[PDB]
Every structure is written in C-alpha cells, then in structure tokens.
From TrEMBL, chain A:
Gene name linked to the record: pol
UniProt keyword annotation of Ligase present: no
Location in or out of the cell: Host cell membrane; Host cytoplasm; Host nucleus; Virion
Predominant location category: host cell
Domain Integrase catalytic span(s) in chain numbering: 1-143
Protein name: Gag-Pol polyprotein
Membrane topology per record: Lipid-anchor
Keyword terms, alphabetized: Aspartyl protease, Capsid protein, DNA integration, DNA recombination, DNA-binding, DNA-directed DNA polymerase, Endonuclease, Eukaryotic host gene expression shutoff by virus, Eukaryotic host translation shutoff by virus, Host cell membrane, Host cytoplasm, Host gene expression shutoff by virus, Host membrane, Host nucleus, Host-virus interaction, Hydrolase, Lipid-binding, Lipoprotein, Magnesium, Membrane, Metal-binding, Multifunctional enzyme, Myristate, Nuclease, Nucleotidyltransferase, Phosphoprotein, Protease, Repeat, RNA-binding, RNA-directed DNA polymerase, Transferase, Viral genome integration, Viral nucleoprotein, Viral penetration into host nucleus, Viral release from host cell, Virion, Virion maturation, Virus entry into host cell, Zinc, Zinc-finger
First-to-last residue of the parent protein present: 57 to 209 of 288
Catalyzed reaction equations: 3'-end directed exonucleolytic cleavage of viral RNA-DNA hybrid; Endohydrolysis of RNA in RNA/DNA hybrids. Three different cleavage modes: 1. sequence-specific internal cleavage of RNA. Human immunodeficiency virus type 1 and Moloney murine leukemia virus enzymes prefer to cleave the RNA strand one nucleotide away from the RNA-DNA junction. 2. RNA 5'-end directed cleavage 13-19 nucleotides from the RNA end. 3. DNA 3'-end directed cleavage 15-20 nucleotides away from the primer terminus
Cofactor(s) needed by this chain: Mg(2+)
Keyword hit for Translocase: no
Any single GO CC term annotated in Swiss-Prot or TrEMBL for this entry: host cell cytoplasm
TrEMBL record, chain B:
Annotated localization: Host cell membrane; Host cytoplasm; Host nucleus; Virion
Domain Integrase catalytic: 1-136
Full protein name: Gag-Pol polyprotein
Taxonomy, superkingdom: Viruses
Length: 148, 140
C-alpha cells in the first residue's frame, strides 16, 4: 500500500538518528535528533505526513512511540499507529536492513562532513536517488498510480 | 518543470522560517530555522534534494543564498542556482493554527500539512502534494 511507513530509531556516534521508511518504495527519511523523546519523534512524524500521504506508521512500542505527543500527532494528521514491528519478524528485517545500509552510506561520506547531521542527509540523498528506478522514483510512481 | 523550486526566507514572531516552493505545483516546504546563515540554507537544500528531484533553485541576491556553503551544496547535489505571495498564504494559515499550537515550529509544520494536503479547492481538485506527484511522475 502507498501509505504504510515504519518509524524506528538506530543509534550512532552516541546520537539517535530517527529513520522513517516507505515500505512499498523503500524511500527513507532520516535526521539526527537530540534524544529519543516523544515531542522530537512527533515533530518528525508531523512533518513526514505534511509532505507525504501518511495513513499508517509501524512503530516499536518504545516510550517515545507511546508518547502522548505522538498520539496527538497521529490523531491530528489521521495516522494509524501500529506497534507491529516488535511482534512481526518479516517487518523486523525491513527496518533492520534499511538501518544497516543507511549506516553503511553514513560512514562512506562521514569524512566528507564534520557533523553527523549533514552526513546523514548526504547518505539519505545517496540512498533515495540511487539505484529499474531509485527509491524516490518508486514512491512518486506508487502514489501517482494510486491517484487513479 | 518537474525539478524547479524557489528558495526564500521569511520572519515571524522574530523567528526565521525557510520556505521552498515547487513552482509548477505550489507544493511547499518550510521550517523554523535558527538564522539566515547560508550554511543553514545549504543544509535545508541538501535534504530537500535527498527526497525530491531538485534540478534548479531560483533564489534572490541575499548573503545566505549566495554563500560558498550553498554553492558547494548545489555542486555536491547537482542543483543549478538562479514568491512573497506564497509566503503570506502560509503566514495566514499559521495565524489560523498558531493559537492551537504551543510553538511556532509545530504551527508551521501544521500549516504546511494543511496547504499541501487539505487545500484542494482549485482547478482539478488535486492538492499541491498530489500535483507535484503528478508532475514528477509524468516526467518519467
Ligand atoms: C494531546 C496534546 C494536545 C497535548 N499537548 C500538545 C503536545 O502534546 C504537542 C507536542 C508535539 C510537539 C511536536 F513538535 C509535534 C507534535 F506532533 C506534538 N504539542 C502541540 O502543539 O500539538 C498540537 C498541534 C501540533 O501536534 C497535534 O497534536 C496535538 C496538537 C495537534 C496539533 S499540550 O501541551 O498539553 C497543549 C499545548 C497547547 C495547547 N493550546 C490549547 N488551546 C486552548 C486555550 C486552551 S490547549 C493546549 C494543550
């Protein structure tokens, strides 16, 4: 489906790095966050939905994901929270693979930037616009096709 | 065109709000930023290129958009460098939601959500977010 996403967090350099993955296209949206708090996770979710059609988000059952803010955000935007990744191994592998590959790219360009923040955005660019087609191409196709 | 955008920055409540408008579709991207440094403009553009196909970016002559930081940015990404109305439409929607939000920040991600998605009252019935997908998808 075109509106299914997976919000998880992978740590690096003693930093948090939030990671949202369009499951259908594999397109990724990532950003270094101060800490795995609820408001930070919610801001990220509010923005992703304000840019893409977000209808369901598969979270991990953590404290940040069950935060009152994340609930308010999922309600105000119409996002259906589903703590499924912790109990579905088929969905677990997806978040696992994307996080490690994103981690690989983040290292390949880490020396090209002093801060991790910039390094991850450079890594996101690489992942989405590189490859059939690239991830950023698949998601626009997925969405526009559904728009029939 | 499918890759043409326009970067400018606006101030509200004494805070900076960077803004990027896909010209064909009217799709918006905004964020409260710390200050108009040009190093920030470069960061904002970098992730923007990471998610959307950014081919050219039409800016003004300000010091932030002309920084060498920005030039290195467009060079690593492939961007070719070169609006107030859209800026005031957001100021309006943000005024409608600011009283409902605790921080301008969230109020701008909320007013953005509305514009790109819950603003379908125009020719064709699509939202700005539906249009950019239409535009980019067609190019393919
Ligand atoms: C259940 C919540 C309502 C609890 N609170 C809000 C916080 O949870 C979120 C945290 C957050 C930060 C992010 F960075 C991103 C997020 F997604 C969320 N802040 C927020 O503004 O969220 C808002 C809007 C933005 O996200 C959606 O979720 C909630 C709504 C909704 C749109 S609150 O502190 O108790 C509170 C704050 C102001 C306010 N004004 C009032 N006005 C009347 C005169 C009384 S009542 C009232 C209560």
């Amino acid at each position: 489906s075109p509106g299914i996403w997976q919000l998880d967090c992978t740590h690096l350099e003693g930093k948090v790095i939030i990671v949202a993955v369009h499951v259908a296209s594999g397109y990724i949206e990532a950003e270094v966050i101060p800490a795995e708090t609820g408001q930070e996770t919610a801001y990220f979710l509010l923005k992703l939905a304000g840019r893409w059609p977000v209808k369901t988000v598969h979270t991990d059952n953590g404290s940040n994901v069950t935060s009152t803010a994340v609930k308010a955000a999922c309600w105000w935007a119409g996002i259906k929270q589903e703590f499924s990744i912790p109990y579905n191994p088929q969905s677990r592998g997806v978040v696992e693979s994307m996080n490690k590959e994103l981690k690989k790219i983040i290292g390949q360009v880490r020396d090209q930037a002093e801060h991790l923040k910039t390094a991850v955005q450079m890594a996101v660019f690489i992942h989405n616009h590189k490859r059939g087609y690239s991830a950023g191409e698949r998601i626009v196709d997925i969405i526009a096709t559904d728009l029939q």
